[PDB]
Design a binder for these strands. Structure first.
Ligand SMILES: Cc1cc2nc3c(=O)[nH]c(=O)nc-3n(C[C@H](O)[C@H](O)[C@H](O)COP(=O)(O)OP(=O)(O)OC[C@H]3O[C@@H](n4cnc5c(N)ncnc54)[C@H](O)[C@@H]3O)c2cc1C
Length: 456
DNA sequence: TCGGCTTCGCGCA
DNA sequence: TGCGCGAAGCCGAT
């Protein structure tokens, strides 16, 4: 459908029909940004061909009640900035509240929409809304992958066992799908308050806030400023200051050597394709570039592949057969310690290192990448059953991580607990053949005491 | 029917 | 710290 700098493989049709004479509506869910957004560019290209304006619709659901204020304020503040950025391009944004299956369908009929476009997400709840919208609309419905450099349905048609099988498939498609973004052209034709939604949401989540002994909040909101503009600043500082020594110090939690882009990446406030574009052009350590590109291209987009082809990505069934047989055999093994969800959540275990990892999660909303493996693996070792460990790790990850409720989180937890995208290791009690990590192993790789002292 | 697996632990410079 | 090996199951190039 038209376009020169426009790869049609990024867009697929969800529902055919006659294109109405109304504006093209971009249903924005995952990629909350105005720049480097294929879904917004496709909505603008379609609207240009039909001489109609383009509008953006965001639907606020009740899913914010399952998370904390840290995620709600981070997303809402970025949406207010996004509202001004879209208005400067004469693109109006409508914020609806309620069920997307009921509000999007009612919006299309009331606004006399002609074409519906949405971004892609492999999560289960996103597909449920899409099937409901299809049953309530009669206009064409398109889906755009604006989150991955290579479209998730294009990179692989099946669940990928390991990276070394998915790695050649991704890099072989990079010369085609890695490209600069065209500028978002403003509109020619022009035709709820977010401040009120922010206040109403905060008062709803206030009783569930994570508090200290003196009733002081644990979350520190000054570490990550939300927004499309602030995401660009973080990307620039990583390339200039941190990309060089990323390869050597990425597994040292005592050193702030990560990109810190996951909160913006999860909410779509910055495009991973843009970051890869800037990283590829940077003249930095070749080993560091390969290590970072492997994370933001292979492991990030294999997480989408995992969730897209495994609808039970958050369940014990999604684990590989060897891992399920191993974990089932050790269900009766006596655990050295048993902790409940409340004790895990408050950092009340015998391991100071694990407690320090949980403290970083509660206070900053972003636990270090290396400690997230030790954090999740120890949960498996000190829980009743593999089902309980999976439930507890997912519950804490989605509640307190700014990047939680993400395909990376479910793939990351499945890797740590079920060995997904991993292999078998030495046989052990309780954990079976799943990859093992120990406190002593952390002591030889980084200064464990410094990490503990930083977070009590 | 082999070769190599993200990110492992461990012994040894 | 940095390096080589161990312990393990399996995909995929043939
Ligand atoms: C148990 C566990 C839970 C995790 N929880 C989440 C989560 O809720 N949300 C989330 O986005 N990621 C999660 N991660 C994946 C990864 O640890 C994070 O992307 C990373 O810690 C975020 O910090 P960073 O962007 O500064 O890291 P960087 O080293 O700068 O990573 C760069 C980018 O690459 C991607 N990436 C890096 N590591 C991984 C990985 N192991 N798997 C997939 N993609 C990766 C992310 O998009 C990340 O922003 C989790 C991993 C594990 C093992």
């Amino acid at each position: 459908p038209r376009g020169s700098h426009m790869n049609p493989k990024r867009i697929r049709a969800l529902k055919s029909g006659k294109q109405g004479d109304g504006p093209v509506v971009y249903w924005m869910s995952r990629d909350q940004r105005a720049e480097d957004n294929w879904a917004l560019l496709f909505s603008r290209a379609i609207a240009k061909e039909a001489n109609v304006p383009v509008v953006v619709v965001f639907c606020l659901t009740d899913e914010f009640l399952e998370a904390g204020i840290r995620q709600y304020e981070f997303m809402l503040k970025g949406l207010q900035e996004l509202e001004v950025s879209l208005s400067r391009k004469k693109i109006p944004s409508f914020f609806l509240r309620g069920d997307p299956g009921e509000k999007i369908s009612r919006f299309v009929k009331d606004y006399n929409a002609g074409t519906l476009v949405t971004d892609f997400s492999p999560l289960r709840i996103k597909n449920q809304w899409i099937e409901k919208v299809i049953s309530g609309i009669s206009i064409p419905f398109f889906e755009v992958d604006a989150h991955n450099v290579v479209p998730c349905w294009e990179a692989s048609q099946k669940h990928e066992y390991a990276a070394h099988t998915f790695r050649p498939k991704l890099y072989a498609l990079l010369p085609e799908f890695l490209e600069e973004f065209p500028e978002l052209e403003p509109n020619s034709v022009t035709p709820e308050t977010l401040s009120d939604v922010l206040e109403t949401g905060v008062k709803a989540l206030l009783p569930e806030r994570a508090l200290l002994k003196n009733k002081d909040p644990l979350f520190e909101p000054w570490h990550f400023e939300p927004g499309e503009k602030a995401a660009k600043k973080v990307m620039e500082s990583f390339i200039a200051d941190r990309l060089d020594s990323y390869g050597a110090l990425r597994n040292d939690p005592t050193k702030n050597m990560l990109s810190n882009l996951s909160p913006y990446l999860h909410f779509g406030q910055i495009s991973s394709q843009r970051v890869v574009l800037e990283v590829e052009k940077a003249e930095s350590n070749p080993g560091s570039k390969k290590a970072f590109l492997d994370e933001i291209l292979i492991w990030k987009e294999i997480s989408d592949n995992f969730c897209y082809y495994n609808p039970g990505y958050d369940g014990f069934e999604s684990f590989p057969s060897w891992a399920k047989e191993s974990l089932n055999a050790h269900r009766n093994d006596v655990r050295s310690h048993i902790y409940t969800l409340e004790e895990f959540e408050a950092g009340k275990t015998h391991d100071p290192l694990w407690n320090a990892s949980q403290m970083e999660l509660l206070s900053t909303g972003k636990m270090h990448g290396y400690t997230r493996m030790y954090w999740a693996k120890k949960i498996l070792e000190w829980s009743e059953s593999p089902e309980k460990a999976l439930e507890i790790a997912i519950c804490l990850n989605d509640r307190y991580e700014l990047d939680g409720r993400d395909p990376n989180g479910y793939a990351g937890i499945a890797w740590s607990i079920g060995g997904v995208h991993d292999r078998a290791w030495g046989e052990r009690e309780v954990t079976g053949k799943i990859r093992y990590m120990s406190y002593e192993g952390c002591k030889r790789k980084f200064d464990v005491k410094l990490y503990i002292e930083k977070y009590s």
